[PDB]
Write an enzyme that holds these catalytic residues in place. Structure first.
Site, PDB file in Angstrom:
ATOM      1  N   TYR A   1       0.844  -1.220   0.000  1.00  0.00           N
ATOM      2  CA  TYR A   1       0.000   0.000   0.000  1.00  0.00           C
ATOM      3  C   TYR A   1       0.880   1.271   0.000  1.00  0.00           C
ATOM      4  CZ  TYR A   1      -4.562   2.182   1.485  1.00  0.00           C
ATOM      5  OH  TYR A   1      -5.745   2.874   1.589  1.00  0.00           O
TER       6      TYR A   1
ATOM      7  N   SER B   1       3.952  -6.966   1.720  1.00  0.00           N
ATOM      8  CA  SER B   1       2.824  -6.465   2.543  1.00  0.00           C
ATOM      9  C   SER B   1       1.505  -6.839   1.856  1.00  0.00           C
ATOM     10  CB  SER B   1       2.981  -4.985   2.876  1.00  0.00           C
ATOM     11  OG  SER B   1       2.228  -4.646   4.053  1.00  0.00           O
ATOM     12  N   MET B   2       0.673  -5.889   1.444  1.00  0.00           N
ATOM     13  CA  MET B   2      -0.538  -6.238   0.669  1.00  0.00           C
ATOM     14  C   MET B   2      -0.153  -6.913  -0.651  1.00  0.00           C
ATOM     15  SD  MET B   2      -3.230  -3.170   1.031  1.00  0.00           S
ATOM     16  CE  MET B   2      -4.030  -2.730   2.573  1.00  0.00           C
TER      17      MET B   2
ATOM     18  N   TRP C   1       0.628  -9.093   4.363  1.00  0.00           N
ATOM     19  CA  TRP C   1      -0.658  -8.811   5.053  1.00  0.00           C
ATOM     20  C   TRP C   1      -1.837  -9.231   4.169  1.00  0.00           C
ATOM     21  CZ3 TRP C   1      -5.082  -6.023   4.325  1.00  0.00           C
ATOM     22  CH2 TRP C   1      -5.953  -6.022   5.426  1.00  0.00           C
TER      23      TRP C   1
ATOM     24  N   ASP D   1       8.140  -5.880  13.068  1.00  0.00           N
ATOM     25  CA  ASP D   1       7.125  -5.281  12.165  1.00  0.00           C
ATOM     26  C   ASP D   1       6.008  -4.728  13.043  1.00  0.00           C
ATOM     27  OD1 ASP D   1       5.076  -4.851  10.173  1.00  0.00           O
ATOM     28  OD2 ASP D   1       6.108  -6.327   8.861  1.00  0.00           O
TER      29      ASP D   1
ATOM     30  N   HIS E   1       9.104  -3.229   9.103  1.00  0.00           N
ATOM     31  CA  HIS E   1       8.168  -3.702   8.053  1.00  0.00           C
ATOM     32  C   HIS E   1       8.885  -3.742   6.694  1.00  0.00           C
ATOM     33  CE1 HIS E   1       4.422  -4.663   6.231  1.00  0.00           C
ATOM     34  NE2 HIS E   1       4.328  -3.485   5.550  1.00  0.00           N
TER      35      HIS E   1
END
Length: 261
Positions: free
Chosen positions: A57, A130-131, A155, A176, A207
């Protein structure tokens, strides 16, 4: 099996560059995603698998760019993408990831493309942050012919990836605070009972611990390349590198299952 390049060592996998010369280009008319850079080996000596890498993101190709040359230099075509919107969610990121693989397949068939005839379209992999990591796992759940997945600090809204049969390496970042390991990466890892899988947690990592500019490129690069060589090329020369606990002060946790030495 599709073995390419010299017999690997800890040293050759930890190095900035593998054996092959890397070139790249910007995709002219991206089909189903925002923008792409294609990294390819000029002298692999055979067709190579393709890997599509998606940022998180708000993020762009810069966050994940380092994988392009690192993977391509060991015998892969790598496409790093910008999504249609920096605010795309994981389902959209997954569609766009598979669209980038589709276009790499298209460019393989396009005589003007630098990658004309360079790709084995039967051998594809997914990565992302992540996403974009959530998206890589959705890609793998939806497309079980994919040969490997190696998401970083993943994620998703759901941690249940129990249907995944694709060999999956999860890079996790110990400290993270965006996608905490205890609520994201580790429950995602725990959900998968049907695949070769691995969990590599980076000591003190934030992260962005596997992003461009990380200080563990020797270890993370070695594991990423070894995983993709083992599973995308079915190259049992990489079995130990892919499946082994790397025994490194940079790793705070290591887990693996169904990974033969």
């Amino acid at each position: 099996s599709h073995m390419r390049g010299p017999n690997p060592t800890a040293a050759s996998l930890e190095a900035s560059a593998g054996p092959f010369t890397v070139r790249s280009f910007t995709v002219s008319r991206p089909s189903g995603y925002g923008a792409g850079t294609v990294y390819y080996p000029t002298n692999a000596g055979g067709t190579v698998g393709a890997i599509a890498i998606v940022p998180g993101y708000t993020a762009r190709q810069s966050s994940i760019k380092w994988w392009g040359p690192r993977l391509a230099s060991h015998g892969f075509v790598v496409i790093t993408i910008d999504t249609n919107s920096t605010l795309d969610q994981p389902e959209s990121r997954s569609s766009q990831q598979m669209a980038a693989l589709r276009q790499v397949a298209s460019l393989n068939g396009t005589s003007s493309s630098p990658i004309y005839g360079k790709v084995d379209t039967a051998r594809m992999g997914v990565m992302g942050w992540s996403m974009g990591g959530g998206g890589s796992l959705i890609s793998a759940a939806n497309n079980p012919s994919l040969k490997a997945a190696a998401p970083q600090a993943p994620w998703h809204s759901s941690t249940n990836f129990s249907s995944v049969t694709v060999p999956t390496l999860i890079f996790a970042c110990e400290n993270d605070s965006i996608a905490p390991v205890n609520s994201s990466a580790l429950p995602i890892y725990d959900s998968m009972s049907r695949n070769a899988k691995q969990f590599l947690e980076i000591n003190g990592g934030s992260h962005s611990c596997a992003n461009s500019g990380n200080s563990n490129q020797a270890l993370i690069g070695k594991k990423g390349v070894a995983w993709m060589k083992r599973f995308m090329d079915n190259d049992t020369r990489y079995s130990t590198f892919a499946c082994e606990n790397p025994n490194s002060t940079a790793v705070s946790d290591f887990r693996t299952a169904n990974c033969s030495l």
